[PDB]
From a paper:
eIF4E initiates cap-dependent translation by binding to the cap structure (m7GTP) found at the 5′ end of mRNA. eIF4E is part of the large eIF4F complex which includes other proteins such as eIF4G and eIF4A. eIF4F forms a complex with the 40S ribosomal subunit and eIF3, which then shuttles along the 5′-untranslated region (5′-UTR) of the mRNA until it arrives at the AUG initiation codon. The interaction of eIF4E with eIF4G, as part of the eIF4F complex, is competitively blocked by the binding of the 4E-binding proteins (4E-BPs) to eIF4E. The 4E-BP1 and eIF4GI peptides both posses a YXXXXLΦ motif (Φ signifies any hydrophobic residue). In this study we isolated a novel phage derived peptide against eIF4E and identified two amino acid positions outside the conserved interaction motif that improved binding of the eIF4G1 sequence.
Interestingly there were two key substitutions that improved the affinity of the eIF4G1 sequence, a D to S substitution at position 5 and a G to A substitution at position 11. The D5S substitution caused an apparent 4.6-fold improvement in binding to eIF4E whilst the G11A mutation caused an ∼ 2.3-fold improvement. eIF4E was successfully crystallized with the eIF4G1_D5S peptide which revealed the mechanism for the improvement in its affinity over the wild type peptide for this mutation. The hydroxyl group of the serine forms two optimal hydrogen bonds with the amide backbone groups of E7 and F8, which form the initial turn of the peptide α-helix seen in the crystal structure. The amide backbone groups in the first turn of the α-helix are not involved in hydrogen bonds with other residues in the helix and as a result are responsible for the positive dipole found at the N-terminal of helices. The two hydrogen bonds formed by the hydroxyl group of the serine with the first turn of the helix are slightly shorter and hence energetically more favorable (3.2 and 3.4 Å respectively) when compared to the eIF4G1 peptide (3.3 and 3.5 Å respectively) in the crystal structures. In the alternative complexes in the asymmetric unit of both structures the bonds distances are 3.0 Å and 3.5 Å for the S5 modification compared to 3.5 Å and 4.4 Å for the D5 residue, respectively. In the simulation of the eIF4G1 wild-type peptide, the D5 side chain occasionally forms hydrogen bonds with the R186 side chain of eIF4E, causing a slight deformation at the N-terminal end of the α-helix in the bound peptide. When the capping residue D5 is changed to S5 in the eIF4G1_D5S peptide, the deformation appears to be attenuated. This results in greater stabilization of E132 of eIF4E with R6 of the peptide, leading to improved interactions of the peptide with eIF4E.
Numbering used by the authors:
A (entry chain A): 27 to 208, 212 to 217
B (entry chain B): 51 to 62
Write the structure that this text describes.
Amino acid sequence: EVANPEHYIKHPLQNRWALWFFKNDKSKTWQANLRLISKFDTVEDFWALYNHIQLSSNLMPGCDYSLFKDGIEPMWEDEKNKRGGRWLITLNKQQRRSDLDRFWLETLLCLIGESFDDYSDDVCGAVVNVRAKGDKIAIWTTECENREAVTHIGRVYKERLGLPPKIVIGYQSHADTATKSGKNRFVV
Amino acid sequence: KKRYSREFLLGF
Ligand SMILES: C[n+]1cn([C@@H]2O[C@H](COP(=O)(O)OP(=O)(O)OP(=O)(O)O)[C@@H](O)[C@H]2O)c2cc(N)[nH]c(=O)c21
């Protein structure tokens, strides 16, 4: 007889996730300021990383966190991002104190817990931008033409964030973001 | 496939 797995085994995540940090430095390229922190693939290792790092509300404005599937870089130019896009949450200045950390934590949970069911494979990762004019949180998906998947993810995400029907959140493709000034392909 | 609810995850 061997030991019972339940008593000593870590709780495996469906995917391995990598956490990235971005710090704004004017002298360098956008890419150069993007850096890997750390990867994990269990619930326990998720918490070990989360619990020792700064809350987003405490980061210096100009900085980002990004949680992305191992092997997917948190940039448009990644193979899995190029034809993709993002569900974007736009937060006003007061929401840094009330919602930012709550919404970001909920987003991580949606990611690592695979809350998107059949469409988990469409999810690339998520990004929180800490910015003076207003913080942003976003889930990145792989294909902006996948209307069924993109739309399912939006709906799940909104309800998990607990946002009411009056709050309209949009999905833009990265190709549009990269190449145009600030329309939504979908709303939720 | 591994799915975890938010309540399960928050317990850790
Ligand atoms: C996510 N991202 C951002 N950037 C660069 O960073 C600039 C700022 O974008 P970003 O940090 O996502 O958003 P911000 O609130 O800081 O600026 P804003 O355009 O949304 O007003 C953007 O205009 C690009 O020049 C990128 C440049 C790339 N070559 N590939 C990226 O994925 C990429």
